């Protein structure tokens, strides 16, 4: 359908960022389940519709493109000029229709927090996010960023402000506020517990029996305290904007 989903660090606003995430959400939804949007069933698509690109500009000249797998919203490759780099665990068909007229290269780690964090000797809680850290990522990568420590470090930023923002209304509100207040922020325990439990939340919702997840989801609030969820009527459930497809509930 449409892949030139673009956001420009230039003269951005909370409103322009929200328009970015809205477009990005409209692209990846392939259904509703218990009224919440769910990404497409991976069996339903052909490799050619499996990837999209988000163009992140700092200027009409400097900017990068990120390859996203609509099947799970992950970042699998990034492109700068006629050079694309593919994460170590991007699917096999990646390079087939991602950054085709470019010298494609493989990176030696995947976009899994864990591997990215292993590389950037920092953790998500240490890496600040905001328009300033985004602008630097675009510049580092464009510039011919070659360092693995810092490539891994700027992917964390990119993944959270883009892929993690698309999935949860909470994370986009946060990203939107740091923009509106020109203030960088380090992800709190809620943000991280949300990022960590995406799959678990998605499953519980789709597998729920009588307004009930077969298995409880333990989140954490900002004060860093247990918020256990195990029902569709629990209000925390509403911060979910996009679920990972896991199974079609029997009718």
């Amino acid at each position: 359908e449409d892949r030139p989903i673009k956001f420009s660090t230039e003269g951005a606003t909370s409103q322009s960022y929200k328009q970015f995430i809205e477009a990005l959400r409209e692209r990846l939804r392939g259904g509703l389940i218990h009224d919440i949007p769910v990404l497409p069933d991976p069996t339903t698509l052909q490799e050619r519709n499996r990837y999209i690109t988000v163009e992140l500009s700092n200027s009409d000249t400097e900017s990068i493109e990120v390859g996203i797998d609509v099947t799970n919203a992950y970042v699998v490759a990034y492109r700068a000029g006629t050079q694309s780099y593919f994460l170590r665990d991007a699917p096999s068909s990646a390079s087939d229709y991602l950054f085709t007229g470019t010298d494609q290269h493989s990176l030696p780690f995947y976009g899994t927090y864990g591997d990215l964090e292993r590389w950037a000797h920092q953790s998500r809680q240490q890496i600040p996010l905001g328009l300033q850290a985004l602008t630097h990522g675009i510049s580092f990568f464009r510039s011919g960023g070659n360092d693995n420590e810092e490539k891994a470090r700027t992917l964390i930023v990119i993944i959270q402000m883009v892929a993690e923002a698309a999935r949860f209304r909470y994370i986009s509100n946060r990203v939107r506020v740091s923009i509106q207040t020109g203030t960088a922020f380090q992800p709190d325990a809620a943000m991280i517990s949300l990022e960590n439990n995406w799959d678990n939340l998605s499953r519980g919702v789709q597998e729920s029996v009588q307004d009930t997840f077969p298995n409880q989801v333990t989140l954490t609030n900002i004060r860093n305290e247990p918020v256990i969820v195990d029902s569709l009527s629990h209000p925390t459930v509403a911060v979910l904007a996009l679920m990972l497809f896991v199974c079609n509930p029997p009718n």
Partner: protein, 267 residues
């Protein structure tokens, strides 16, 4: 779409507590599992015990210690009780827990309710009016979700006496913390005996704080994925009036999806 795949398993049968009115649990009175014993609203005990644990079977029955949660009758007012599954009229043992927190006996179309504010009051089946006292939520942990709530122009809901309007989000303010209960109410952490309520059921109705004692429809709220705080009974949502925080008013209004109607729980 094409050769579609996976279907979710129907073998799941969780046993969890069911919290409801004022945070109380569905309780088999005195672990009395004799046929006809009354089911009540009791305090959710500090430990997970059998008379407070219910298995959500795949045949639509709700069991505790094997016995089934069964109505007495199919008329508004008939009490619910514990009873051997195969001996009671099949249809009186079937229950449906909706996404909005309503437990309905399909056959009677009547709904589980905690008509009494008193801890220990018997549960009955009543006509469905989407009242706070007919709202439940499953899961062993029945603890409220204490959170702040921001909305229009990134302002947070603040309790100022018995009124409520948008103000600067301030982590320090205890008047901006709300306890989202199992029954679907939005209580002020300063006095959990108060619930966000709509004065009337008409569009324009101002919502404010009133006692949760009566458990009316205007005191039960549902947080939708679209961002609205929806009123199941009146088909309406919370509205920051005329997208103007300065009017210090949050009213009841139909969903148009405008920015003055979207809210977020900040944990």
């Amino acid at each position: 779409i094409v050769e579609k795949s996976k279907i979710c398993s129907s073998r799941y049968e969780p046993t969890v507590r069911i919290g409801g009115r004022d945070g109380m649990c569905v309780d088999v009175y005195d672990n009395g599992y004799h046929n006809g014993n009354r089911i009540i609203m009791w305090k959710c005990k500090d430990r997970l015990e059998e008379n407070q644990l219910w298995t959500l079977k795949s045949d639509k029955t709700i069991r505790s210690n094997g016995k089934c949660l069964t109505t007495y009758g199919y008329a508004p007012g008939s009490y619910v009780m514990i009873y051997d599954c195969t001996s009671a009229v099949a249809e009186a043992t079937y229950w449906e827990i909706w996404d909005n927190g309503t437990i309905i006996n399909p056959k009677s179309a009547l709904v589980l309710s905690a008509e009494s504010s008193s801890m220990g009051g018997t549960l009955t089946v009543q006509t469905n009016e989407y009242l706070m006292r007919q709202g439940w939520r499953t899961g062993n942990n029945t603890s409220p979700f204490v959170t702040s709530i921001s909305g229009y122009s990134d302002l947070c809901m603040q309790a100022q006496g018995s009124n409520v309007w948008m103000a600067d989000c301030d982590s320090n303010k205890k008047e901006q913390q709300w306890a989202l209960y199992t029954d679907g109410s939005i209580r002020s952490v300063q006095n959990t005996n108060n619930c966000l309520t709509s004065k009337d059921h008409k569009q324009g109705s101002t919502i404010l704080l009133m006692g949760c004692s009566n458990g009316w429809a205007s005191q039960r709220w549902v947080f939708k994925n679209d961002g609205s705080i929806y009123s199941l009974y009146d088909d309406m949502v919370m509205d920051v009036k005329g997208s103007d925080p300065s009017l210090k008013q949050i009213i009841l209004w139909p969903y148009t999806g405008k920015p003055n109607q979207i809210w977020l729980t900040l944990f």
